[PDB]
Protein backbone atom coordinates (compact mmCIF):
# COMPACT_ATOMS: atom_id res chain seq x y z
CA UNK A 1 0.00 0.00 0.00
CA UNK A 2 1.22 3.55 -0.81
CA UNK A 3 0.67 4.49 2.90
CA UNK A 4 2.78 1.56 4.19
CA UNK A 5 5.81 3.82 4.89
CA UNK A 6 3.91 6.50 6.88
CA UNK A 7 3.53 6.40 10.67
CA UNK A 8 0.02 5.60 11.97
CA UNK A 9 -0.04 8.93 13.95
CA UNK A 10 1.03 10.85 10.81
CA UNK A 11 -1.80 9.23 8.77
CA UNK A 12 -4.37 10.28 11.42
CA UNK A 13 -2.90 13.83 11.57
CA UNK A 14 -3.08 14.11 7.77
CA UNK A 15 -6.67 12.68 7.67
CA UNK A 16 -7.69 15.61 9.98
CA UNK A 17 -5.88 18.12 7.69
CA UNK A 18 -7.56 16.60 4.59
CA UNK A 19 -11.00 16.97 6.33
CA UNK A 20 -10.26 20.70 6.96
CA UNK A 21 -9.17 21.08 3.28
CA UNK A 22 -12.33 19.21 2.04
CA UNK A 23 -9.96 16.65 0.34
CA UNK A 24 -12.07 13.57 1.14
CA UNK A 25 -10.38 11.15 -1.33
CA UNK A 26 -7.05 11.95 0.41
CA UNK A 27 -8.76 11.62 3.83
CA UNK A 28 -10.07 8.13 2.88
CA UNK A 29 -6.65 7.01 1.61
CA UNK A 30 -4.97 8.21 4.89
CA UNK A 31 -7.60 6.40 7.02
CA UNK A 32 -7.32 3.18 4.95
CA UNK A 33 -3.55 3.37 5.57
CA UNK A 34 -4.21 3.79 9.32
CA UNK A 35 -6.60 0.79 9.41
CA UNK A 36 -3.98 -1.38 7.56
CA UNK A 37 -1.47 -0.80 10.42
CA UNK A 38 -3.54 -3.57 12.10
CA UNK A 39 -4.32 -1.81 15.45
CA UNK A 40 -7.91 -1.27 16.59
CA UNK A 41 -9.36 2.24 16.06
CA UNK A 42 -10.40 4.64 18.80
CA UNK A 43 -13.87 6.29 18.72
CA UNK A 44 -12.47 9.48 17.08
CA UNK A 45 -10.51 7.38 14.48
CA UNK A 46 -13.66 5.33 13.62
CA UNK A 47 -15.50 8.62 13.04
CA UNK A 48 -12.68 9.86 10.73
CA UNK A 49 -12.89 6.63 8.68
CA UNK A 50 -16.71 7.03 8.42
CA UNK A 51 -16.61 10.73 7.45
CA UNK A 52 -13.97 10.13 4.75
CA UNK A 53 -15.69 7.26 2.94
CA UNK A 54 -19.23 8.72 3.39
CA UNK A 55 -18.06 11.90 1.60
CA UNK A 56 -16.34 9.95 -1.24
CA UNK A 57 -19.28 7.55 -1.84
CA UNK A 58 -21.69 10.50 -1.40
CA UNK A 59 -20.20 12.26 -4.43
CA UNK A 60 -20.34 8.99 -6.43
CA UNK A 61 -24.00 8.33 -5.50
CA UNK A 62 -25.02 11.87 -6.43
CA UNK A 63 -23.23 11.54 -9.82
CA UNK A 64 -24.69 8.03 -10.44
CA UNK A 65 -28.23 9.35 -9.80
CA UNK A 66 -27.77 12.22 -12.31
CA UNK A 67 -26.45 9.78 -15.00
CA UNK A 68 -29.12 7.09 -14.27
CA UNK A 69 -31.88 9.76 -14.67
CA UNK A 70 -30.45 10.85 -18.07
CA UNK A 71 -30.14 7.15 -19.14
CA UNK A 72 -33.77 6.40 -18.10
CA UNK A 73 -35.04 9.45 -20.09
CA UNK A 74 -33.10 8.18 -23.18
CA UNK A 75 -35.00 4.79 -23.00
CA UNK A 76 -38.48 6.47 -23.24
CA UNK A 77 -39.97 9.84 -28.37
CA UNK A 78 -36.25 9.92 -27.27
CA UNK A 79 -33.56 10.41 -30.01
CA UNK A 80 -30.97 7.57 -30.13
CA UNK A 81 -27.62 9.05 -28.99
CA UNK A 82 -25.37 5.98 -28.88
CA UNK A 83 -23.67 4.08 -26.06
CA UNK A 84 -22.05 7.05 -24.25
CA UNK A 85 -24.63 7.66 -21.45
CA UNK A 86 -24.67 3.96 -20.51
CA UNK A 87 -20.84 3.70 -20.73
CA UNK A 88 -20.29 6.75 -18.49
CA UNK A 89 -22.97 5.62 -15.94
CA UNK A 90 -21.23 2.22 -15.91
CA UNK A 91 -17.81 3.91 -15.31
CA UNK A 92 -19.17 5.85 -12.29
CA UNK A 93 -21.05 2.73 -11.09
CA UNK A 94 -17.86 0.58 -11.22
CA UNK A 95 -15.88 3.22 -9.23
CA UNK A 96 -18.71 3.44 -6.63
CA UNK A 97 -18.75 -0.39 -6.31
CA UNK A 98 -14.95 -0.32 -5.89
CA UNK A 99 -15.18 2.17 -2.99
CA UNK A 100 -17.86 -0.01 -1.32
CA UNK A 101 -15.77 -3.17 -1.82
CA UNK A 102 -12.75 -1.35 -0.28
CA UNK A 103 -14.72 -0.36 2.87
CA UNK A 104 -16.26 -3.88 3.16
CA UNK A 105 -12.79 -5.35 2.78
CA UNK A 106 -11.42 -3.24 5.69
CA UNK A 107 -14.37 -4.32 7.86
CA UNK A 108 -13.77 -8.01 7.00
CA UNK A 109 -9.92 -7.73 7.30
CA UNK A 110 -10.01 -7.28 10.28
CA UNK A 111 -11.99 -4.49 12.00
CA UNK A 112 -15.20 -6.45 12.84
CA UNK A 113 -13.53 -9.62 14.19
CA UNK A 114 -11.33 -7.57 16.65
CA UNK A 115 -14.28 -5.36 17.79
CA UNK A 116 -15.53 -6.61 21.18
CA UNK A 117 -17.02 -3.53 22.84
CA UNK A 118 -20.62 -2.72 21.89
CA UNK A 119 -19.77 0.79 20.62
CA UNK A 120 -17.10 -0.44 18.18
CA UNK A 121 -18.95 -3.62 17.08
CA UNK A 122 -22.29 -1.77 16.43
CA UNK A 123 -20.39 1.04 14.57
CA UNK A 124 -18.67 -1.46 12.23
CA UNK A 125 -21.78 -3.61 11.62
CA UNK A 126 -23.84 -0.48 10.83
CA UNK A 127 -21.07 0.52 8.33
CA UNK A 128 -21.25 -2.99 6.79
CA UNK A 129 -25.06 -2.55 6.39
CA UNK A 130 -24.56 0.95 4.90
CA UNK A 131 -22.00 -0.06 2.23
CA UNK A 132 -24.10 -3.13 1.19
CA UNK A 133 -27.06 -0.66 1.01
CA UNK A 134 -25.04 1.59 -1.37
CA UNK A 135 -24.22 -1.54 -3.48
CA UNK A 136 -27.98 -2.37 -3.45
CA UNK A 137 -28.89 1.12 -4.79
CA UNK A 138 -27.09 0.30 -8.12
CA UNK A 139 -27.65 -3.49 -8.23
CA UNK A 140 -29.85 -4.98 -11.06
CA UNK A 141 -28.39 -8.50 -11.72
CA UNK A 142 -27.17 -10.84 -6.93
CA UNK A 143 -29.43 -7.79 -6.05
CA UNK A 144 -31.29 -10.18 -3.63
CA UNK A 145 -28.04 -11.48 -2.02
CA UNK A 146 -26.73 -7.85 -1.64
CA UNK A 147 -30.02 -6.75 0.04
CA UNK A 148 -29.81 -9.78 2.36
CA UNK A 149 -26.17 -8.93 3.29
CA UNK A 150 -27.25 -5.38 4.22
CA UNK A 151 -30.25 -6.64 6.28
CA UNK A 152 -28.14 -9.29 8.08
CA UNK A 153 -25.48 -6.70 9.08
CA UNK A 154 -28.07 -4.16 10.31
CA UNK A 155 -29.97 -6.89 12.23
CA UNK A 156 -26.81 -8.11 14.07
CA UNK A 157 -26.02 -4.45 14.94
CA UNK A 158 -29.63 -3.87 16.12
CA UNK A 159 -29.57 -6.97 18.37
CA UNK A 160 -26.29 -5.83 20.11
CA UNK A 161 -27.46 -2.16 20.36
CA UNK A 162 -30.79 -3.10 22.03
CA UNK A 163 -29.00 -5.33 24.62
CA UNK A 164 -25.93 -3.14 25.34
CA UNK A 165 -26.81 0.59 24.74
CA UNK A 166 -29.41 3.00 26.10
CA UNK A 167 -32.18 4.05 23.67
CA UNK A 168 -30.66 7.58 23.38
CA UNK A 169 -27.15 6.40 22.41
CA UNK A 170 -26.28 8.27 19.13
CA UNK A 171 -24.77 5.16 17.49
CA UNK A 172 -27.95 3.18 18.36
CA UNK A 173 -30.10 6.05 17.01
CA UNK A 174 -28.17 6.38 13.75
CA UNK A 175 -28.21 2.62 13.19
CA UNK A 176 -32.04 2.58 13.60
CA UNK A 177 -32.33 5.64 11.30
CA UNK A 178 -30.25 3.94 8.56
CA UNK A 179 -32.04 0.55 8.95
CA UNK A 180 -35.40 2.42 8.59
CA UNK A 181 -34.02 3.99 5.35
CA UNK A 182 -33.01 0.45 4.17
CA UNK A 183 -36.59 -0.73 4.80
CA UNK A 184 -38.22 2.24 2.96
CA UNK A 185 -35.79 2.86 0.05
CA UNK A 186 -34.32 -0.68 -0.63
CA UNK A 187 -36.47 -3.47 0.84
CA UNK A 188 -39.95 -2.23 -0.32
CA UNK A 189 -41.07 -2.32 3.37
CA UNK A 190 -42.42 1.20 4.16
CA UNK A 191 -44.56 -0.08 7.06
CA UNK A 192 -41.46 -1.68 8.71
CA UNK A 193 -39.60 1.65 8.14
CA UNK A 194 -42.38 3.72 9.82
CA UNK A 195 -42.75 1.25 12.74
CA UNK A 196 -38.99 1.21 13.42
CA UNK A 197 -38.67 5.04 13.19
CA UNK A 198 -41.68 5.59 15.53
CA UNK A 199 -40.61 3.01 18.17
CA UNK A 200 -36.98 4.31 18.07
CA UNK A 201 -38.16 7.95 18.48
CA UNK A 202 -40.58 7.18 21.36
CA UNK A 203 -38.07 5.00 23.33
CA UNK A 204 -35.43 7.74 22.99
CA UNK A 205 -37.91 10.50 24.09
CA UNK A 206 -38.56 8.51 27.31
CA UNK A 207 -34.78 8.30 28.17
CA UNK A 208 -33.78 11.98 27.43
CA UNK A 209 -34.35 12.86 31.17
CA UNK A 210 -31.17 10.82 32.02
CA UNK A 211 -28.87 12.95 29.82
CA UNK A 212 -26.59 15.94 30.25
CA UNK A 213 -27.21 19.07 28.15
CA UNK A 214 -24.51 18.04 25.61
CA UNK A 215 -25.72 14.36 25.37
CA UNK A 216 -29.30 15.69 24.99
CA UNK A 217 -28.17 17.81 22.03
CA UNK A 218 -26.35 14.80 20.38
CA UNK A 219 -29.46 12.49 20.72
CA UNK A 220 -32.12 15.08 19.73
CA UNK A 221 -30.22 15.96 16.52
CA UNK A 222 -30.69 12.33 15.27
CA UNK A 223 -34.27 12.06 16.63
CA UNK A 224 -35.17 15.08 14.47
CA UNK A 225 -34.12 13.08 11.36
CA UNK A 226 -36.39 10.15 12.39
CA UNK A 227 -39.22 12.74 12.68
CA UNK A 228 -38.32 14.32 9.30
CA UNK A 229 -38.52 10.85 7.60
CA UNK A 230 -41.83 10.05 9.38
CA UNK A 231 -43.24 13.39 7.99
CA UNK A 232 -41.96 12.42 4.47
CA UNK A 233 -43.38 8.81 4.73
CA UNK A 234 -46.86 9.66 6.16
Amino acid sequence: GAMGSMERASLIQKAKLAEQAERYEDMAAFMKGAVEKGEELSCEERNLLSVAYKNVVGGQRAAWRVLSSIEQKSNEGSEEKGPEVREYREKVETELQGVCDTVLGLLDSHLIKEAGDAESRVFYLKMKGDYYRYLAEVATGDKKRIIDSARSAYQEAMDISKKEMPPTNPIRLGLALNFSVFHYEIANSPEEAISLAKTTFDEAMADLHTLSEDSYKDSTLIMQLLRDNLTLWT
Partner: peptide
Protein backbone atom coordinates in the same frame (compact mmCIF):
# COMPACT_ATOMS: atom_id res chain seq x y z
CA UNK B 1 -37.63 13.24 -2.25
CA UNK B 2 -35.14 10.65 -0.74
CA UNK B 3 -35.15 9.63 2.92
CA UNK B 4 -32.47 11.18 5.22
CA UNK B 5 -29.77 8.89 6.58
CA UNK B 6 -27.30 9.56 9.38
CA UNK B 7 -25.10 12.57 8.56
CA UNK B 8 -21.43 13.17 9.38
CA UNK B 9 -20.51 14.65 12.82
Amino acid sequence: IRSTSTPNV
